Each structure stands twice: as structure tokens, then as C-alpha cells.
Enzyme design. Sequence first.
Site, PDB file in Angstrom:
ATOM      1  N   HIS A  62      12.560  -7.815  -1.303  1.00 41.21           N
ATOM      2  CA  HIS A  62      11.129  -7.438  -1.487  1.00 41.21           C
ATOM      3  C   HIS A  62      10.856  -7.029  -2.937  1.00 41.21           C
ATOM      4  O   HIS A  62       9.792  -7.378  -3.473  1.00 41.21           O
ATOM      5  CB  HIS A  62      10.740  -6.313  -0.514  1.00 41.21           C
ATOM      6  CG  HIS A  62      11.020  -6.643   0.914  1.00 41.21           C
ATOM      7  ND1 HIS A  62      10.397  -7.698   1.558  1.00 41.21           N
ATOM      8  CD2 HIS A  62      11.816  -6.049   1.827  1.00 41.21           C
ATOM      9  CE1 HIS A  62      10.801  -7.741   2.811  1.00 41.21           C
ATOM     10  NE2 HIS A  62      11.671  -6.732   3.006  1.00 41.21           N
ATOM     11  N   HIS A  92      10.965   1.751  -7.912  1.00 39.58           N
ATOM     12  CA  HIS A  92      10.819   0.289  -7.816  1.00 39.58           C
ATOM     13  C   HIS A  92       9.466  -0.080  -8.394  1.00 39.58           C
ATOM     14  O   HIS A  92       8.667   0.800  -8.721  1.00 39.58           O
ATOM     15  CB  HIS A  92      10.927  -0.170  -6.359  1.00 39.58           C
ATOM     16  CG  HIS A  92       9.840   0.422  -5.535  1.00 39.58           C
ATOM     17  ND1 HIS A  92       9.984   1.617  -4.862  1.00 39.58           N
ATOM     18  CD2 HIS A  92       8.571   0.014  -5.330  1.00 39.58           C
ATOM     19  CE1 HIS A  92       8.825   1.927  -4.292  1.00 39.58           C
ATOM     20  NE2 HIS A  92       7.941   0.943  -4.562  1.00 39.58           N
ATOM     21  N   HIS A  94       6.058  -3.137  -8.197  1.00 39.45           N
ATOM     22  CA  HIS A  94       5.295  -4.254  -7.609  1.00 39.45           C
ATOM     23  C   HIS A  94       4.697  -5.034  -8.771  1.00 39.45           C
ATOM     24  O   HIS A  94       4.249  -4.405  -9.747  1.00 39.45           O
ATOM     25  CB  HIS A  94       4.195  -3.740  -6.676  1.00 39.45           C
ATOM     26  CG  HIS A  94       4.685  -2.791  -5.638  1.00 39.45           C
ATOM     27  ND1 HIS A  94       4.896  -3.160  -4.334  1.00 39.45           N
ATOM     28  CD2 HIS A  94       5.017  -1.484  -5.716  1.00 39.45           C
ATOM     29  CE1 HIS A  94       5.351  -2.118  -3.655  1.00 39.45           C
ATOM     30  NE2 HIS A  94       5.432  -1.067  -4.487  1.00 39.45           N
ATOM     31  N   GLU A 104      -0.783  -2.372  -7.032  1.00 39.61           N
ATOM     32  CA  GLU A 104      -1.206  -2.073  -5.642  1.00 39.61           C
ATOM     33  C   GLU A 104      -2.488  -1.245  -5.690  1.00 39.61           C
ATOM     34  O   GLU A 104      -3.540  -1.686  -5.179  1.00 39.61           O
ATOM     35  CB  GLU A 104      -0.073  -1.354  -4.924  1.00 39.61           C
ATOM     36  CG  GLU A 104       1.120  -2.257  -4.746  1.00 39.61           C
ATOM     37  CD  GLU A 104       1.985  -1.907  -3.558  1.00 39.61           C
ATOM     38  OE1 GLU A 104       2.402  -0.734  -3.477  1.00 39.61           O
ATOM     39  OE2 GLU A 104       2.226  -2.805  -2.723  1.00 39.61           O
ATOM     40  N   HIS A 117       6.597   2.806  -8.924  1.00 42.23           N
ATOM     41  CA  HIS A 117       6.596   3.874  -7.905  1.00 42.23           C
ATOM     42  C   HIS A 117       7.889   4.665  -8.004  1.00 42.23           C
ATOM     43  O   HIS A 117       8.965   4.065  -7.797  1.00 42.23           O
ATOM     44  CB  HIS A 117       6.418   3.284  -6.512  1.00 42.23           C
ATOM     45  CG  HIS A 117       5.063   2.725  -6.319  1.00 42.23           C
ATOM     46  ND1 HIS A 117       4.792   1.826  -5.316  1.00 42.23           N
ATOM     47  CD2 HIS A 117       3.914   2.950  -6.987  1.00 42.23           C
ATOM     48  CE1 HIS A 117       3.522   1.496  -5.391  1.00 42.23           C
ATOM     49  NE2 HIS A 117       2.947   2.197  -6.385  1.00 42.23           N
ATOM     50  N   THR A 196       3.483   1.645   1.227  1.00 43.72           N
ATOM     51  CA  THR A 196       2.736   0.379   1.033  1.00 43.72           C
ATOM     52  C   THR A 196       3.543  -0.812   1.541  1.00 43.72           C
ATOM     53  O   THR A 196       3.032  -1.928   1.427  1.00 43.72           O
ATOM     54  CB  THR A 196       2.335   0.158  -0.424  1.00 43.72           C
ATOM     55  OG1 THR A 196       3.516  -0.111  -1.177  1.00 43.72           O
ATOM     56  CG2 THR A 196       1.536   1.321  -0.966  1.00 43.72           C
TER      57      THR A 196
END
Length: 258
Positions: A62, A92, A94, A104, A117, A196
Site C-alpha cells: 500500500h 508513511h 500518500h 489525502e 503521516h 484513512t
Amino acid sequence: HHWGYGKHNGPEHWHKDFPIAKGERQSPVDIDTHTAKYDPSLKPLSVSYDQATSLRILNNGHAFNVEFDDSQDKAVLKGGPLDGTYRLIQFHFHWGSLDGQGSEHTVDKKKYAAELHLVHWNTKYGDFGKAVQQPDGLAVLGIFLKVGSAKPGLQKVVDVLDSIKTKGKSADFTNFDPRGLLPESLDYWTYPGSLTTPPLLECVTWIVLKEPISVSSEQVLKFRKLNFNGEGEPEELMVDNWRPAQPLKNRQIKASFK
Ligand SMILES: C[C@]12CC[C@H]3[C@@H](CC=C4C[C@@H](OS(N)(=O)=O)CC[C@@]43C)[C@@H]1CC[C@@H]2C=O
Ligand SMILES: [Zn+2]
């Protein structure tokens, strides 16, 4: 047929396995800067990462997770909107397929290229797994990334990604200092929300910094060379691993700043 970010398993499908996806305090959200209320009762955020001890970096199919030894009271987030003390366990990102998407949270519907995050758990619940069963279990510090100047403190992360290209690959990643990923200002927005990704638990106090960090085009292009798939599987580039903004419902976003 596990969850992911694709047409057939992405965010619009998650509610079937995780019905809390349509819950009352889902994340992320759009931050409407004109509606967010300055709250003079909010405290300065206390980010104490001087003793943070990274262990490993992992590709979980992911994202990639930089993990910390949370066995002692070292790397802690407190103050801001928080009661008590929250311990850093991992960070991590996104990110997008293009610089025009990837975050996000959004700010007046603006999408940043990526979002960092830093995940912390409330020490009053003893460990990470127990904390996520509580409405005040986690504090996630969110930091926007824009493309411009390189972030020197990110380069050690970028340079290890070649060793964890595919799902299930991990590497030793010691002595990484997350202070090198922080912007100058700790001005923030805060609201109650959720994870999330599945399991989408409604256990997070979100703290989103107003000031983005700049990373170079070369740095983010190396994020986009990662793979969602495992070694010896059809190549699916790890891009667009972001959940879109969810309904704010009965929540208030508070600003630490005028
Ligand atoms: C490990 C768990 C599942 C994975 C959970 C974690 C709590 C928080 C996050 C953070 C989230 O990403 S984000 N974007 O919400 O910060 C991605 C999922 C993840 C890692 C759970 C704690 C207990 C549970 C199983 O043991
Ligand atoms: Zn995240």
C-alpha cells in the site's frame, strides 16, 4: 480480493468489508480555511523527536512504513489539542501519479503532491493495538509535500526505496531522524477522525500542519517507482495511494493560528 487503491478494490469499495467507511468521523477531509475557527485555547504542538530510534523500512503493498522502536518513552507528541502523551510508532506517505494529486487532506480543495503521516499512540492505552480501539487512541501528524526544492532530510528514505520495490520487502533503517521532515512552522488544523486505510477505525486526533515541506521532482519520482505488487507479479506502480476527502458531517476543524 483484498482492499487497495484500484477500480475494483479502491476507496469506493472499502465500505463492503469495513462498513465504518460511511461513519460519522471519517478521514481525510477538505479543510475549508475560512470556516476553520481559530481556537485560542489550543496549545503549541510539542514534537520531541531528539531520541527517536528508527528500526526498519517496509513495503506493505500500500505504502512504505518507516518503523520506530516504541519500547521506551522517546519520540513523543504532546500539547496542541492532545491530553497526555503519544508515542511515535511509524511514518508513511500518500502520493500521486502526477504532482497535481496525492494528498489525502485538501486545503480549500487544493491537492498537494503527497502527504506525510507520523502515527503516534496514546501511552494511557499501553500499546498501539489497544489504542486504536479508543476514540482518543492515536494522534496523526499530517504534513503536505509540494514539488520544488529537495528536502535534504528525506534523501536517506529516497535512497533505500530501491531495496524495497515490491510488496513484502523490508530493510534495516536505523538512525533516521524524522526532525528532518518537519517544516519551520508548527501552525496546524485539528479535527477528530479516522484511519484513512482499512480498518478505518475512528480513533484519530488529526493534526495537519499548515506549512508544506518542499521535495524535489526527483525525490517524488522515486516514490512512484515503487510497486503495489509482490516480486515476480505483474508490475503495478505504487501511485495514487490516497483516499479522497470524506464528508465532514457533525465536526469542527480548529486552527491553532489567526
Ligand atoms: C496494525 C493495525 C492495522 C494497521 C493500522 C494500525 C493503526 C493505524 C494505521 C495507520 C494507517 O494509515 S493512516 N493513513 O490512517 O495513518 C494504516 C493502517 C495502520 C497501520 C492498526 C493497529 C492495530 C491493527 C492490527 O494489529
Ligand atoms: Zn496515512
